[PDB]
Each structure stands twice: as structure tokens, then as C-alpha cells.
Design a protein around this nucleic acid. Structure first.
Lengths: 49, 49
DNA sequence: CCGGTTATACTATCTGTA
DNA sequence: TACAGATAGTATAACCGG
């Protein structure tokens, strides 16, 4: 189902700006940023080793 | 402002799984997902060229 | 009892068909 | 071109925890 996240005004402006810059939606941006979140976490943890 | 992320049943289950894996909520998940997206975006800027 | 997160709900805009 | 439906976003409410 649809989700509602409580974000600030400056952060919401950045998310909507990079979402329009990439050419995707906000639901698609979250899906790509959720998988890329695991790619960034695994990359940062591996680099810190 | 509030965010409207339209997620199905599979994507929502995976988002709540990685959120519980980190030990944070979905609100802080997006805050760190956007910060992680910007960290990998900076690496995409230099490494990209 | 008071907030915060989360889901529902209504409304508006875009798109596709007639 | 006009209308109806579908999808996304702002808006509003509900439940749980401190």
C-alpha cells in the first residue's frame, strides 16, 4: 500500500529536484534508492575494512 | 511536508526488512537513503567522467 | 494525554479511448 | 476535442508508545 513519510521542507525539495533531474517518479526513486541503499552500505562497509 | 511513496506488497516488505536490518524507522531510512544517494552521487560525478 | 509514524482517503491532473 | 478512469500527491485521521 501507499506510504507516508514525514520529511522536512528542504529535504523534500531536494528529493523532488533530483527525482525530476533523473527523470523518474517519487515511488520509483524510492525503489531505486532502496536498492542503491544496500549498494552504498555494502560499498562503504567494504571500503572501511 | 509529507511524502507519497506508492509501493506494492513486495517492495514494501523489502523496505521494512532493510529498515529493521539497520535498526531504524522508515522515516530515518529515507533520511539516510537520500544521504546515501548523495554519497554515491558524488562518486558518480568523479568516477563517472 | 500528547506526539509521531503510518495507512487510508479524497482530490486533481494526465492519459487514453470514443 | 471531450469525458471517464487510473494513478499519484497532499490531506486527514487512527493507533501505539512513552
Amino acid at each position: 500500500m501507499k506510504t507516508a513519510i514525514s520529511l522536512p521542507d528542504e529535504t523534500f525539495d531536494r528529493v523532488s529536484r533530483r527525482a525530476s533531474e533523473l527523470g523518474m517518479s517519487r515511488s520509483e526513486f524510492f525503489t531505486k534508492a532502496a536498492q542503491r541503499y544496500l549498494h552504498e552500505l555494502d560499498a562503504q562497509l567494504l571500503t572501511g575494512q
